[PDB]
Amino acid sequence: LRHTFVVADATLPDCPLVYASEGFYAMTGYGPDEVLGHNCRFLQGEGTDPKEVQKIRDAIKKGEACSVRLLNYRKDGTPFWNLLTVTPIKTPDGRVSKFVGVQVDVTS
């Protein structure tokens, strides 16, 4: 299947993105100059379910893995359905260093 991949830096408090695959930009229409160093939430919009967004917010705070189905928006405003799976990467001392996300456009 067609998927995308990003890396969030958990040492910084708001989990900014530090790496995105070629597909992530092409899927969403944002360039690296407007993605890197920002929280992934810029992809959200009016129809994003705040109950689902809360599920990721909690999991990141707890440091667990999570999977949600969010409504996102490209740079041109058009919506797409992003199945998102976040995964915590821990150092050997249990501390969370990075979060990693796989995004799949499941508008079908």
Annotated binding site: 39-44, 57, 72, 82, 103
In the block, tokens 């990721």 appear at 56
Residue 86 lies near ligand FMN (rule: CB under 6 A) = yes
Shortest CB 78 distance to ligand FMN, Å: 15
- Which stretch, 29-37, 38-46, 89-97, contacts ligand FMN (CB under 6 A)? 38-46
Residues near ligand FMN (CB under 6 A): 6, 8, 15, 39-41, 43-44, 53, 56-57, 60, 70, 72, 82, 84, 86, 99-101, 103
